[PDB]
Design a protein around this ligand. Structure first.
Ligand SMILES: *[C@@H]1O[C@H](CO)[C@@H](O)[C@H](O)[C@H]1NC(C)=O
Ligand SMILES: *[C@@H]1O[C@H](CO)[C@@H](O)[C@H](O)[C@H]1NC(C)=O
Ligand SMILES: *[C@@H]1O[C@H](CO)[C@@H](O)[C@H](O)[C@H]1NC(C)=O
Ligand SMILES: [Ca+2]
Length: 204
């Protein structure tokens, strides 16, 4: 555990520095200029490990567009943020890229994600493991009943903390405090997570 600021973990589980965003992640607009989902300077083998065109958000029927928007933000933060270094667990190489633990997600990001997913459906509370991937995309395992989102995630805390097995630990702090990570931002007005990484690098 060395470099914590402006750093990435790639799909081969080596640390790397960020760079200009790649074409696959074009919709991840906040990270266009400085991203861990970056172009490569060498002829590294091309294999997309992104969830953007891989994960089946509609495993229990149509996910409401408002819910999907949060999942896009979530995916973009995980795949592109160069400000998660303080939470990277380097011994764990079992995720598609970095394993992060207890990232202090801003209160608003979590509560509104939970609200906006009220009318969507899912079949499990931990989305990292346990899917049936034989069709190429993930489907619910046999016996895993589709239910309203709040059946499996009864509070915002349960959603944000459990969905990716403690990747997030929702904060009591809110946006603008410099003490929590937000899932999206306007880049022309500045990346607020840079300050947040600095704060926790000094504490962790
Ligand atoms: C660049 O290399 C990385 C690391 O292997 C890989 O994940 C990515 O798919 C490559 N980029 C392209 C252009 O596919
Ligand atoms: C996975 O899905 C396929 C059908 O696409 C099915 O044959 C198989 O039994 C499923 N396995 C589980 C564990 O649900
Ligand atoms: C959250 O809890 C921490 C630790 O107890 C405390 O320092 C801080 O004042 C709290 N922040 C808010 C916004 O409640
Ligand atoms: Ca960021």
């Amino acid at each position: 555990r060395t470099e914590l600021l402006n750093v990435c973990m790639n799909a081969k589980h080596h640390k790397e520095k960020p760079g200009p965003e790649d074409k696959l992640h074009e919709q991840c607009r906040p990270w266009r200029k400085n991203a861990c989902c970056s172009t490569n300077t060498s002829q590294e083998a091309h294999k997309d490990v992104s969830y953007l065109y891989r994960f089946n958000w509609n495993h229990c029927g149509e996910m409401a567009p408002a819910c999907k928007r949060h999942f896009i933000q979530d995916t973009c933060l995980y795949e592109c943020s160069p400000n998660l270094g303080p939470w990277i667990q380097q011994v764990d190489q079992s995720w598609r890229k970095e394993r992060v633990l207890n990232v202090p997600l801003c209160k608003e990001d979590c509560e509104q994600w939970w609200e906006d997913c009220r009318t969507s459906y899912t079949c499990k509370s931990n989305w990292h493991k346990g899917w049936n991937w034989t069709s190429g995309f993930n489907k619910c395992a046999v016996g895993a009943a589709c239910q309203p989102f709040h059946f499996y995630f009864p509070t915002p805390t349960v959603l944000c903390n459990e969905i990716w097995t403690h990747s997030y630990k929702v904060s009591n702090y809110s946006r603008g405090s410099g003490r929590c990570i937000q899932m999206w931002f306007d880049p022309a007005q500045g990346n607020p997570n840079e300050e947040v990484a600095r704060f926790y690098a000094a504490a962790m």
